[PDB]
Design a protein around this ligand. Structure first.
Ligand code: HEC
Ligand code: HEC
Ligand code: HEC
Ligand SMILES: COc1c(O)c(C)c(C/C=C(\C)CC/C=C(\C)CC/C=C(/C)CC/C=C(\C)CC/C=C(\C)CCC=C(C)C)c(O)c1OC
Ligand SMILES: C/C=C(C)/C=C/C=C/[C@H](OC)[C@@H](C)[C@@H](OC)[C@@H](C)CCc1oc2c(O)c(OC)cc(OC)c2c(=O)c1C
Lengths: 245, 125, 55, 62, 385, 93
């Protein structure tokens, strides 16, 4: 199939979480959340992530509580049955920008910004893809490419024509920890944050794997030895034939 | 495939000097590559025995050949399980790789075929 | 290995001792692994990030 | 050949200066396999049993 | 006599696992069967614990699986074990089948054993498909759509069978709820078929790598093979563990992390890897009916081998031409799989059609021709007259 | 119990094999044997033999298929590049 239709292969960046013994970098997760809140959240929902999961990961119990309370959620009807709102709690899920699909399409030239809860696992390339997409918008499309009105060119997206315009620009965010908010830095951070949203069990999963693999390896090496011992009499057994008179 | 049939085709090739000089050398090379002789086996020891013809045949085999087949088979399993081959001096030589069970098999197939023929004979008046 | 004959003296290890040793192993092994893991990832953990935060 | 003439096992037999040499090694291996298995089985059982405890999303402090 | 022999229940255990006489020479290729029983157990246990947290309603299925992944303690371990285990179940089954093919295990007196195995294989393929649909991701919806549609190729009543399977106008709630119910049931029917498989195995015992009788030298299952089985059980668990903990999604499809959408079929749709060779076979026939008939025939043709293998010796160990063509068959099968993973494009379409021919030609032409030639070669190479 | 059909395998004491006579076997307790460490120096060069006889049966069919695969792939790549769009229109429909 043509290269344009397939999309440009995303290269392999040196993510700090790549490697069997590597955990996520939690400071990057912390920063990624800010980029998500200040840039992405205007068009992208994050439906599967509950506030409580942030605690002990990227924020404190107090910080998350404040963040949740900035949003109103439907509450149980009062004594008389009329509906009533309520500030958010830790048990709630991060709210999305649109009330329904139709309202989301209207605000984006008819396109639908997907939920990002699983985006890292729902695309070949994973982090490499997401990062590359965000930092891969050329100022001008290659010569000859007739880009439809309202569309944008990005070599990493299949078909090259994507409905999301470039949204990351240098210093559009003021990192709370003082880090220089370059576009590639912000891309690196949200992407790390989105990987955690999709794989919250990552750090713990690899820790368990380490114990599991050590025990199983030992059991394997050990069983070989035990088997050879139990078979030694059979393996070294010897026969002699003396034809009967 | 019956041994009567393998014999029919094989003998036809063996008689005709055209085919006989063309095939046998190929067949000889095939037999050496097979490798069964390195385990101490004779080809006839390799015939699948779980059928009535082969049971009739093995039953009719003289004692001495029977005890011999038994030793060769046991020796082959033991060598196979040790992942080795026998020392070269113990391999079966071509002169020894004789079709010792073949005559008993052919005889039983003929007896069997005749019964099948006689049980189904039509009659004309 | 005479180290074996001191503890078990030519006899195999009995299930009771095996079970008991397993409970011990479970705890020891877990701490050893968690320690190495957290150390290998020093700087990236939330523990480390919280130290550089004050609010 | 005479059945009383036992074939050569020299290549397999250990020069017995330490009688319980193979026994100690075998029993240590068997014992260690028994230990790591029991710990493994215990961990497997707890993993499954704990999947039935209250889920993270239902521990709401009303 | 010993209690293990006298007790009604224990004697079954004794005759099948303790005193069962095994041919002394079976190699590690004979360890696959126990690995298959182990796989069956892993799938059943992990599936029941997950069922406890799963909702089959089409509106909740995908989220209920995300709930298992996020909120259930050790939930991701159960799901990843189940998903990766299904793949491992197929890898081992192919090896178990390939072993049978190579050693003439399908031959008399083990024909019944082989036939039951073919049934288990069909049931296992159906069970995995039903499970895959339960996730209700994009691949789930379209997989359910495409596969239930296979039956529309049946003349006259085909579309009726499909609407009946669906429970409506298209793959919807009724469909996913019945597929979960059926996914839970089939594993138990497979278990009953495995017992029938072991029953046929017991009357004649296992075969061996030499292809000849094992009656002159047997050793008890207990101790020898129990511990030899243990060696591969751990190696199997180690490798499964590497995937479950270190690379849990490498054997799946990213599109199944997207909720099913009835109005859009992804351009990236690709069947599960273990179904690729069959998919390729179907795709190679440019006709609807014939495509589905040929694909099903690719499975049923396995039943023909006891009749087309004309050899007078069981197995390929001492057969030069048969060994060569066996490997042509294996690699041809891998090719069929690589073609299934490719686009319906020029070089690929023709290669798939030729590989499909080679697949069927192996059972119907190559084996009978080659086995006959080998029969004759064995004869003229020793008869001096 | 109920009559059982004749098979090709019996049980200990009546396995169904032919009568054995003249064969004498010998064995030595695994306990009396040199603990697992001798599988080297004596059992190393001897190994790798059950693949030196087999690799050709595996390699040749593998080679044929890998080459065939590489070729068709590289041809597909050419067909979908600029240089091959002419040939593409020809071989396509
Ligand atoms: C609204 C103006 C947007 C903002 C702010 C961001 N995104 Fe977006 N995104 C938007 C649309 C309209 C689309 C649809 C694209 C299409 O052609 O259908 C998207 C899509 C994405 C995707 C998915 C791409 C794919 O492979 O299908 C990703 C990974 C994505 N967006 C990421 C992303 C991030 C991380 C953002 C903040 C840094 C961000 N988006 C902002 C619209 C808008
Ligand atoms: C209820 C008991 C139950 C049994 C018994 C069971 N499963 Fe499942 N299986 C499930 C549930 C629940 C799901 C959905 C969760 C999931 O996706 O893993 C599932 C999903 C699947 C999936 C999809 C995996 C994925 O990608 O998420 C496959 C494939 C599968 N099962 C294969 C099997 C096989 C093969 C067997 C039997 C040999 C089996 N299952 C037995 C309950 C069961
Ligand atoms: C289509 C073929 C086929 C399938 C599928 C199959 N089997 Fe078998 N099985 C056989 C044959 C044939 C043998 C006899 C092999 C021999 O002795 O040479 C066998 C033997 C066995 C053995 C004995 C040990 C061994 O590996 O030879 C066990 C145990 C076994 N199978 C279990 C299973 C289980 C469990 C499943 C599936 C869940 C399964 N089989 C599926 C064909 C099959
Ligand atoms: C002649 O050759 C042989 C041979 O004969 C045999 C037997 C073996 C050995 C292998 C086997 C016997 C394999 C057998 C496997 C099976 C019979 C599989 C049966 C499968 C099942 C899944 C059983 C059903 C189980 C359950 C319902 C339990 C799950 C549920 C639970 C734990 C409930 C949980 C709930 C709560 C509330 C705690 C060989 O290896 C062999 O060749 C060397
Ligand atoms: C209620 C129970 C029912 C209805 C059971 C039905 C069982 C059917 C068969 O099993 C016996 C069937 C699964 C088996 O055919 C022999 C497989 C090889 C089918 C292979 C198969 O997979 C696909 C797939 O997985 C997809 O996913 C995204 C998409 C697909 O197209 C794009 C296919 C496809 O085109 C084919 C042929």
């Amino acid at each position: 199939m043509t290269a344009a239709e397939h999309g440009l292969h995303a290269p392999a960046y040196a993510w700090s979480h790549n490697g069997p013994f590597e955990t996520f970098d939690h400071a990057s997760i912390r920063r990624g959340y800010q980029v998500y809140r200040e840039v992405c959240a205007a068009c992208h929902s994050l439906d599967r992530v509950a506030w409580r999961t942030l605690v002990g990961v990227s924020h404190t119990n107090e910080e998350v509580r404040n963040m949740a309370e900035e949003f109103e959620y439907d509450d149980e009807p009062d004594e008389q049955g009329n509906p009533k709102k309520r500030p958010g709690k830790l048990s709630d899920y991060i709210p999305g920008p649109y009330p329904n699909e139709q309202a989301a399409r209207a605000a984006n030239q008819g396109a639908l910004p997907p939920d990002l809860s699983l985006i890292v696992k729902a695309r070949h390339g994973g982090c490499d893809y997401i990062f590359s997409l965000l930092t891969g918008y050329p100022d001008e499309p290659p010569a000859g490419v007739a880009l439809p009105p309202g569309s944008n060119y990005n070599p990493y997206f299949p078909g090259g024509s994507i409905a999301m315009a470039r949204v990351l620009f240098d210093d559009m965010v003021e990192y709370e920890d003082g880090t220089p908010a370059t576009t590639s830095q912000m891309a690196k951070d949200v992407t790390t944050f989105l990987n955690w949203c999709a794989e919250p069990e990552h750090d713990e999963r690899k820790r368990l794997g380490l114990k599991t693999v050590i025990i199983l390896s030992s059991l394997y090496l050990l069983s070989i030895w035990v088997k050879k011992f139990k078979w030694a009499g059979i393996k070294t057994r010897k026969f002699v034939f003396n034809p009967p008179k | 495939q019956s041994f009567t049939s393998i014999a029919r085709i094989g003998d036809y090739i063996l008689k005709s000097p055209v085919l006989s000089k063309l095939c046998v050398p190929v067949a000889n090379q095939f037999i050496n590559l097979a490798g069964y002789k390195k385990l101490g086996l004779k080809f006839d020891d390799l015939i699948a025995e779980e059928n009535p013809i082969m049971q009739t045949a093995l039953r009719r085999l003289p004692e001495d050949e029977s005890y011999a087949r038994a030793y060769r088979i046991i020796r082959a399993h033991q060598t196979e399980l040790t992942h080795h081959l026998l020392p070269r001096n113990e391999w079966i030589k071509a002169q020894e790789d004789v079709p010792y069970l073949l005559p008993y098999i052919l005889e039983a197939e003929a007896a069997a075929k005749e019964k099948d023929e006689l049980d189904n004979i039509e009659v004309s008046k | 290995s005479s180290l074996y004959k001191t503890f078990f003296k030519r006899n195999a290890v009995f299930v009771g001792t095996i079970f008991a040793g397993a409970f011990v192993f479970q705890t020891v092994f877990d701490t050893a692994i968690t320690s190495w893991y957290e150390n290998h990832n020093k700087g990236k953990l939330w523990k480390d990030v919280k130290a550089r935060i004050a609010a | 050949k005479s059945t009383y003439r036992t074939p050569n096992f020299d290549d397999v037999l250990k020069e017995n200066n330490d009688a319980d040499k193979g026994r100690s090694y075998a029993y240590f291996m068997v014992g260690a396999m028994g230990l790591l298995s029991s710990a493994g089985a215990k961990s497997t059982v707890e993993t499954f049993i704990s999947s039935m405890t209250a889920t993270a999303d239902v521990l709401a402090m009303a | 006599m010993a209690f293990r022999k006298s007790n009604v229940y224990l004697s079954l255990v004794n005759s099948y696992i303790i005193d069962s006489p095994q041919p002394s020479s079976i190699n590690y290729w004979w360890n696959m069967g126990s690995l298959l029983g182990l796989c069956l157990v892993i799938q059943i246990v992990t599936g029941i614990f997950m069922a406890m947290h799963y909702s089959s309603n089409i509106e909740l299925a995908f989220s209920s699986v995300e709930h298992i992944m996020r909120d259930v303690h050790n939930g991701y371990i159960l799901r990843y074990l189940h998903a990766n285990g299904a793949s491992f179940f197929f890898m081992v089954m192919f090896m178990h089948m390939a072993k049978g093919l190579y050693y003439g295990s399908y031959r008399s007196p083990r024909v019944t054993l082989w036939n039951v195995g073919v049934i288990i294989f069909t049931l296992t393929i159906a069970t995995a498909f039903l499970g895959y649909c339960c996730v209700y991701g994009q691949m789930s919806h379209w997989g359910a759509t495409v596969i239930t549609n296979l039956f529309s190729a049946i003349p006259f009543v085909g579309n009726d069978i499909v609407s009946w399977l669906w429970g409506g106008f298209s793959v919807s709630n009724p469909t996913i709820q019945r597929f979960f119910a059926l996914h839970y049931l089939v594993p138990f029917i497979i278990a009953a078929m495995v017992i029938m498989h072991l029953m046929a195995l017991h009357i004649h015992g296992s075969s061996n790598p030499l292809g000849i009788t094992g009656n002159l030298d047997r050793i008890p299952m207990h101790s020898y093979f129990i511990f030899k089985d243990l060696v591969t059980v751990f190696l199997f668990m180690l490798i499964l563990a590497l995937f479950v903990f270190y690379s849990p999604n490498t054997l799946g499809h990213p599109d199944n992390y997207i909720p099913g959408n009835p109005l859009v079929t992804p351009a990236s749709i690709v069947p599960e890897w273990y179904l690729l060779p069959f998919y390729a076979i179907l795709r190679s026939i440019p006709d609807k009916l014939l495509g589905v008939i040929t694909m099903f025939a690719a499975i049923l043709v396995l039943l023909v081998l006891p009749f087309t293998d004309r050899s007078v010796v069981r197995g390929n160990t001492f057969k030069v031409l048969s060994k060569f063509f066996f490997f042509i068959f294996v690699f041809n099968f891998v090719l069929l799989g690589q073609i299934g993973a490719c686009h319906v494009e020029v070089p690929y379409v023709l290669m798939g059609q030729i590989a499909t021919f080679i697949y069927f030609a192996y059972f119907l032409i190559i084996v009978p021709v080659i086995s006959t030639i080998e029969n004759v070669l064995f004869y003229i190479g020793r008869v001096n007259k | 119990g109920p009559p059982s059909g004749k098979t090709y395998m019996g049980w200990w004491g009546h396995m169904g094999g032919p009568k054995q006579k003249g064969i004498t076997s010998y064995a030595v307790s695994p306990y009396a044997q040199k603990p697992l460490q001798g599988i080297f120096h004596n059992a190393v060069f001897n190994s790798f033999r059950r693949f030196k006889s087999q690799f050709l049966y595996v390699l040749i069919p593998a080679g044929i298929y890998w080459y065939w695969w590489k070729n068709g792939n590289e041809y597909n790549e050419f067909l979908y590049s600029k240089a091959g769009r002419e040939e593409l229109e020809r071989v396509n429909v």
